[PDB]
Structures are given as C-alpha cells and as structure tokens.
C-alpha cells in the first residue's frame, strides 16, 4: 500500500461526484476512485495538481485545507478479537 501525501500547503479542489463514497478499514468516510481523477491544491505561490490513480481511496474532502507531507490518498489469516 502506497500513501499519496500532499506536496504543498493549500486547498483541496476536486469534484466529489466523480468518486463513490465508502468506509475505510479504519472507520472513516472516504471516496473510492476508479478513474483518472485530477485533484487541485491551491497553494500559497501557485495552483498545483496531484494525479490520483484509480482503485485508490481518497481520504480528503473538497475545499479542505491540507498540510505538506500529509496523507491525502491511499493506493491499494483468521484472528479473534475480544471486547
């Protein structure tokens, strides 16, 4: 599993209608991506674009603020648990 990390501080810009809502294995809401999605980070100097490959989980929302080196996307026995 490879983690896409935000390369700049900025504002996430993408259309949420091209992605399918899901639920991560960590219990978080997320967007499943099956296409060649384009994500825009509006940084302090210029606008930057990050390409998200298909079959990947997009963990951020549109218009969300992200920091540099922050994970924004994820690319991808029998045990018994007691409560």
């Amino acid at each position: 599993a490879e983690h896409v990390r935000a390369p700049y501080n900025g504002k996430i810009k993408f259309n949420e209608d091209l992605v399918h809502p899901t639920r991560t294995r960590h219990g978080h809401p997320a967007f499943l991506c099956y296409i060649d999605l384009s994500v825009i980070i509006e940084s302090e100097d210029i606008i930057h674009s990050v390409t998200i490959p298909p079959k990947s989980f997009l963990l951020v929302q549109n218009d969300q603020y992200v920091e540099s080196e922050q994970v924004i996307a994820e690319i991808r026995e029998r045990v018994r648990k007691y409560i």
């Binding site: 983690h3 990390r5 960590h26 080196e69 994970v71």
Partner: protein
C-alpha cells in the same frame, strides 16, 4: 493505530537519506552507511527516526 504509525515510521526512513544528502552530506552517520562501510539504513532509522 497500527497502520498510521507504520506509515509514519516508514516515511521517516524514506526521507532520512535525502535529508542527509542535501543538508549534511559529510554527517558521520551518513558516511558510515552511505559508503557501505558499517551499518544500513534500517539501523540508522532506529537511531534517528
């Protein structure tokens, strides 16, 4: 908890060498392992990551 801290630990190991190569090329820990003399990146990560 397992995967968030494994991803954080593995990201420190990746950036350990470019940090050494760009900002402290003659750092003793870097030279002792980058030259291939004694020690690998995993053991240095145990010391600095």
């Amino acid at each position: 908890s397992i995967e968030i801290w494994y991803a954080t630990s593995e990201y420190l190991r990746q950036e350990m060498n470019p940090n050494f190569r760009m900002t402290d090329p003659f750092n003793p820990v870097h030279m002792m392992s980058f030259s291939g003399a004694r020690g690998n990146a995993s053991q240095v990560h145990q010391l600095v990551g």
